[PDB]
Amino acid sequence: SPISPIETVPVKLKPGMDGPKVKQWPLTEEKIKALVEICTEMEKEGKISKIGPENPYNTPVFAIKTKWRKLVDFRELNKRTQDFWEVQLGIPHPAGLKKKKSVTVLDVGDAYFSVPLDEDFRKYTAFTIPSINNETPGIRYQYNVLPQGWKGSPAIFQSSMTKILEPFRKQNPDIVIYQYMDDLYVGSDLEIGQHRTKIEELRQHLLRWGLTTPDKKHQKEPPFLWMGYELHPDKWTVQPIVLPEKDSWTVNDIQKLVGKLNWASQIYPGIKVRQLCKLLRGTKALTEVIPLTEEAELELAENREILKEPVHGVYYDPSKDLIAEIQKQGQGQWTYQIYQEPFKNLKTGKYARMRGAHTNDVKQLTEAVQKITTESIVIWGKTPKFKLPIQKETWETWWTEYWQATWIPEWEFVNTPPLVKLWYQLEKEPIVGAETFYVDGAANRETKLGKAGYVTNRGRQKVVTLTDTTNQKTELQAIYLALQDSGLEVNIVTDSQYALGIIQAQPDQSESELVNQIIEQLIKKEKVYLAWVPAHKGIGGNEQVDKLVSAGIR
Amino acid sequence: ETVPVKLKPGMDGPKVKQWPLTEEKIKALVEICTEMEKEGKISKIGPENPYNTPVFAIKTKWRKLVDFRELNKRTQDFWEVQLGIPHPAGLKKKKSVTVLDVGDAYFSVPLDEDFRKYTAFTIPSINNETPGIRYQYNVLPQGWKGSPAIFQSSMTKILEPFRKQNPDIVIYQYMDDLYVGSDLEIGQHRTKIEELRQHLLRWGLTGYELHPDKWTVQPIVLPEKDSWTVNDIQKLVGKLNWASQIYPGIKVRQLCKLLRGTKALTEVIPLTEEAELELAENREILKEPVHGVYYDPSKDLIAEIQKQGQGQWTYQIYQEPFKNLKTGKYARHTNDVKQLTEAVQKITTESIVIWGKTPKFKLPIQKETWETWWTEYWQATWIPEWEFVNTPPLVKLWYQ
Ligand SMILES: NCc1cc(Cl)cc(Oc2c(Cl)ccc3c2nnn3Cc2[nH]nc3ncccc23)c1Cl
């Protein structure tokens, strides 16, 4: 196997650091023999060279098993090697692949061993095959090539592959080359002949540079199995997903289930994972059996149904626009599809996130549009045209009245229920002929006890005692009280910016049962006007609820 | 001959991830970089450079914008202490200030061989087909604060005839731009800019018009009403109780006296003339600058922006919260992101003119919406630092 004639990549150690000096542990005779055999073969091939006694560095060697393998413990050298640039920013996604007339897979033979190592850095790769019972001096070698397990190998190989491919890519702009690890994926729209000719020209260019690749009878045939994907000539899919039928599910079983479903989510539309994920909440043992809930059984059933039949994705056509469609699956769950030609999907996906403790479908939909937008730029270098289950008017009302700079690129309403709506709207001005509730909450921070209440301009009053509470929980409880004893139209005055904030953002869902109860009330209401005052300023009705809730508390 | 650049001790070069870029923006950068390489300004690099700085393309011709925010922070001692450019107090007083892009000057001066690695950037690829195209600078890079710092001496000799001939023209160099101010009539001012463009033209280097003297306060506005409701007074006392934390001599005692008993919000309540006395007196304090607030050169500047609806935005610049050095407003086919980037740029240029430093922004937006979109509208050669905030609902109405 050749060692590429390319210019070496200069390697440095970390500033203030010298090479490893880790003592070789004595080995068994069988391990020493195995290593001697291995090392003399590599020495012949040019891979390693014998060194003198002057070299003071050392990295330990070991051998494991009918054939023997040599394992170098590069942990110490790796701790002293300079940092390298990140090999890759991401992984190619199948949906980003164009449909090519012919595609061939070329894997590089003994990749790392085919590329030289900086002459001035070779000294730090020094290792010793010990003598029987460490009696006499050992056999000393250093690497001439990129060693397996060393920190710079992935990076230096990739960089070497880049400089090599450079002149070929310049003279063949209509040829696709995917660089992945020690593989090269070559695609073109040439006729089955001039492509076969171009592959040999590539193979030959690579050989002139120490890199060996398979010939026609050894190169793989489609479908290509790569990274959990199946790449057929006119479609792609995920590899066979088989969901286990278990009597008892363990933490580990559900974890593997969730992972498999998540992976299936990229092409199979409608995959749900919330109810299964909920079972994984908390601290439970790998082998601990989790009984499924009704909701988890229902979600598993729907998922088995989705996966019953096989689904495929199509490839990318650069001359067509991408269309992204989103649907509300349920509570906090969003599902999307991306296509160019109606309903022939390139890919699919899901969004189920909790951005805060209080949110709404409008905020969730914009969060999903941003997630999809980013993804599209990564996969295709362009954003899609959205088809959203929200009316232009609902969106317009939200962005106009919300405090946050909220935006959505080119979109269109699509009537695919459940539709995204605002469940209630707060008043802009106080209501004439509605009772004004002044609300307050106060909790003692030693006892944890608090009081929640209100006073009205109609002389009405109420004070409820609460047990293991906070000032925030009491303030929210006070609002709930005022909503409960109110009637269709209310003006509410609070000194809580915290409560003001939650309610003002029009939440339709919360991780707080109290906030969900407030939502239930706000919906039933015809008109609500929420106003704010500074606390402890002796303000009108505010000083009155203050004295009432403070009594025996603060 | 290169000026040796040393990084701040203990910390090393920037290792900042590259953002996804659209097909159009990548092609624009590849074309730009191929050319800069041919011209020897940038060199293709090895994997042995662990450093990275993000790169973007802005706009009628595409231009490369390198985000040196992390490199700048890491070289602060160099461009600020060691090689600082003094900021003129006169610039903010000038009737006109023209901004000129002078960043093309930087590529005539080489970068210290031992600092070049710290300028690494990557042109990304679509669907990760290709490893990014990696490069580093051989010349002073545009967007790095160390560039005007080093070029300072060369800029001094280019401007010397112009300055000797025009002693009342203020010239300030901030990053890639030159800020040229005069108290002349607009025609004579525009004539003097053309004259300076000719001086710059003999050395290689090749307008945007501000009027700093016509920049005024955005006072905390106190309403002027016939009928005052319980709610209107409550809203007024809230606004004044908060202004009293900034401004010395604010009084609410008389307006507060009115808010007695648990009254209905819609109830019209007559005013007491002593309450009108306070109103008048507070309105007067609110129009004038804040007493006791001074710019501290060693402390960072903060800018806060609030969406007011109807395409209007309010902002405040301070160093210590609510101790406001400046307040203002930005008013607008536009969207919130486009509007927000426009306000960020206007506030930054005013901040450069007034203090010689960009503020760190508290943006009322989603990190992701901002990240994906900001480049679609960005026009400036610099990028300020920014945080993402959840605007308190009251800060919005007290600044309305
Ligand atoms: N190791 C996997 C692998 C991963 C990656 Cl990320 C890229 C790969 O190579 C392709 C190239 Cl170079 C171009 C189009 C492709 C490819 N793969 N699929 N399609 C679409 C396509 N066009 N024509 C095809 N003919 C046969 C199979 C798929 C085809 C390969 Cl084989």
Coordinates of C-alpha atoms in Angstrom, one line a residue, chain B residues 66-256:
Chain B
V66 CA -16.3 38.8 8.7
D67 CA -17.6 38.6 12.3
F68 CA -14.5 39.5 14.3
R69 CA -16.4 40.1 17.5
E70 CA -14.6 37.2 19.4
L71 CA -11.1 38.1 17.9
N72 CA -11.8 41.8 18.9
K73 CA -12.6 40.9 22.6
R74 CA -9.4 38.7 22.6
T75 CA -7.2 41.6 21.3
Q76 CA -8.8 44.4 23.5
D77 CA -5.5 45.4 25.0
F78 CA -3.9 45.9 21.6
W79 CA -6.5 48.2 19.8
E80 CA -7.7 50.0 23.0
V81 CA -4.7 50.4 25.4
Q82 CA -1.5 49.7 23.3
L83 CA -2.7 51.4 20.0
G84 CA -5.9 53.3 20.9
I85 CA -7.6 55.9 18.6
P86 CA -8.7 59.0 20.5
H87 CA -12.4 60.0 20.2
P88 CA -13.2 63.7 19.5
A89 CA -15.9 65.3 21.7
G90 CA -16.6 67.8 18.9
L91 CA -18.0 65.2 16.4
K92 CA -21.4 65.0 18.2
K93 CA -21.7 68.8 18.1
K94 CA -21.2 69.1 14.2
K95 CA -24.1 70.1 11.8
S96 CA -23.2 67.3 9.4
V97 CA -21.2 64.1 9.8
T98 CA -20.5 62.0 6.6
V99 CA -19.4 58.3 7.0
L100 CA -16.9 57.0 4.5
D101 CA -15.9 53.3 3.9
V102 CA -12.1 53.3 4.1
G103 CA -11.6 49.5 4.7
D104 CA -10.0 48.9 1.3
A105 CA -6.9 50.7 2.8
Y106 CA -6.2 47.7 5.1
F107 CA -5.3 45.3 2.3
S108 CA -2.2 47.3 1.4
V109 CA -0.6 46.6 4.8
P110 CA 0.6 43.0 5.7
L111 CA -0.5 41.2 8.9
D112 CA 2.2 39.8 11.4
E113 CA 2.9 36.2 10.3
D114 CA 2.4 35.0 13.9
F115 CA -1.1 36.5 14.1
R116 CA -2.5 35.3 10.7
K117 CA -3.8 32.0 12.2
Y118 CA -6.2 33.9 14.4
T119 CA -8.1 35.3 11.3
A120 CA -9.2 31.8 10.1
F121 CA -12.7 31.6 8.5
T122 CA -14.6 28.9 6.6
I123 CA -16.9 29.2 3.5
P124 CA -19.5 26.4 4.2
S125 CA -21.0 24.0 1.7
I126 CA -24.7 23.0 1.1
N127 CA -25.7 19.6 2.7
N128 CA -22.1 19.3 3.8
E129 CA -20.9 17.8 0.5
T130 CA -17.6 19.4 0.8
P131 CA -15.5 20.3 3.8
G132 CA -15.6 24.1 4.1
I133 CA -13.2 26.2 2.1
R134 CA -10.8 27.5 4.8
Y135 CA -8.7 30.7 4.6
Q136 CA -6.7 33.1 6.8
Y137 CA -5.6 36.7 6.2
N138 CA -2.1 37.9 5.0
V139 CA -3.2 41.6 5.2
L140 CA -5.1 43.7 7.8
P141 CA -8.6 42.3 7.8
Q142 CA -11.7 44.5 7.5
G143 CA -13.9 44.2 10.7
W144 CA -10.9 43.6 13.0
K145 CA -10.4 46.5 15.6
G146 CA -6.6 45.9 15.3
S147 CA -6.7 47.0 11.7
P148 CA -7.5 50.8 12.1
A149 CA -5.2 50.6 15.2
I150 CA -2.2 49.6 13.1
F151 CA -3.2 51.7 10.1
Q152 CA -3.5 54.8 12.3
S153 CA 0.0 56.2 11.4
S154 CA -0.6 55.7 7.6
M155 CA -4.0 57.3 7.9
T156 CA -2.4 60.3 9.8
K157 CA -0.1 61.1 6.8
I158 CA -2.9 60.7 4.2
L159 CA -5.1 63.3 6.0
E160 CA -2.3 65.7 7.1
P161 CA -2.7 68.1 4.0
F162 CA -6.6 68.0 4.3
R163 CA -6.4 68.7 8.1
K164 CA -3.8 71.6 7.8
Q165 CA -6.1 73.1 5.0
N166 CA -9.4 72.6 7.0
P167 CA -8.8 73.1 10.8
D168 CA -12.5 73.1 11.7
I169 CA -13.2 69.6 10.1
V170 CA -13.3 66.8 12.6
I171 CA -12.2 63.3 11.2
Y172 CA -12.6 60.2 13.4
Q173 CA -11.6 56.6 12.4
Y174 CA -13.8 53.9 13.8
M175 CA -13.1 50.4 12.4
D176 CA -13.5 50.4 8.5
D177 CA -15.2 53.9 8.4
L178 CA -14.1 57.5 8.6
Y179 CA -16.5 60.0 10.3
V180 CA -16.1 63.5 8.8
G181 CA -17.8 66.4 10.5
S182 CA -18.2 70.1 9.7
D183 CA -20.3 73.0 10.7
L184 CA -20.5 74.2 7.0
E185 CA -23.5 74.7 4.8
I186 CA -24.6 71.3 3.3
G187 CA -23.2 72.2 -0.2
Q188 CA -19.8 73.3 1.2
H189 CA -19.8 70.2 3.4
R190 CA -20.6 67.8 0.4
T191 CA -17.8 69.8 -1.5
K192 CA -15.3 69.2 1.3
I193 CA -16.2 65.4 1.3
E194 CA -15.5 65.2 -2.5
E195 CA -12.2 66.9 -1.8
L196 CA -11.3 64.3 0.9
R197 CA -12.3 61.5 -1.5
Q198 CA -9.7 62.8 -3.9
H199 CA -7.0 62.8 -1.2
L200 CA -8.0 59.2 -0.3
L201 CA -8.0 58.3 -4.0
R202 CA -4.2 59.1 -4.4
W203 CA -3.4 56.3 -1.8
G204 CA -5.9 53.7 -3.1
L205 CA -8.9 54.1 -0.8
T206 CA -12.4 55.1 -2.1
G207 CA -21.9 59.8 1.1
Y208 CA -23.9 58.5 4.2
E209 CA -25.1 61.8 5.9
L210 CA -25.8 62.3 9.7
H211 CA -26.8 65.5 11.4
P212 CA -25.8 65.1 15.1
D213 CA -26.7 68.7 16.3
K214 CA -30.4 67.8 15.3
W215 CA -30.4 64.7 17.5
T216 CA -32.6 65.2 20.6
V217 CA -34.0 63.4 23.6
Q218 CA -37.0 61.1 23.6
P219 CA -38.5 62.5 26.9
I220 CA -40.7 60.4 29.2
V221 CA -44.0 61.8 28.0
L222 CA -46.6 62.7 30.6
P223 CA -50.1 62.9 29.0
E224 CA -52.1 66.2 28.5
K225 CA -55.8 65.4 29.2
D226 CA -59.2 67.1 29.8
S227 CA -60.8 64.2 31.7
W228 CA -58.4 62.0 33.9
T229 CA -59.7 58.6 34.8
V230 CA -58.6 56.4 37.9
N231 CA -56.7 54.2 35.4
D232 CA -55.0 57.3 33.8
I233 CA -53.7 58.5 37.2
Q234 CA -52.6 55.0 38.1
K235 CA -50.7 54.8 34.8
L236 CA -49.2 58.2 35.5
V237 CA -48.1 57.4 39.1
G238 CA -46.5 54.2 37.8
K239 CA -44.6 56.1 35.1
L240 CA -43.5 58.8 37.6
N241 CA -42.6 56.4 40.4
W242 CA -40.2 54.8 37.9
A243 CA -38.8 58.1 36.5
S244 CA -38.0 59.1 40.2
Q245 CA -35.4 56.3 40.2
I246 CA -33.5 58.1 37.3
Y247 CA -34.3 61.8 37.7
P248 CA -33.6 63.9 40.9
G249 CA -36.6 66.1 42.0
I250 CA -39.5 64.0 40.7
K251 CA -42.7 64.4 42.8
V252 CA -45.8 62.2 42.9
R253 CA -47.2 63.1 46.4
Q254 CA -50.0 65.3 44.9
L255 CA -51.1 62.9 42.1
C256 CA -51.0 60.0 44.7

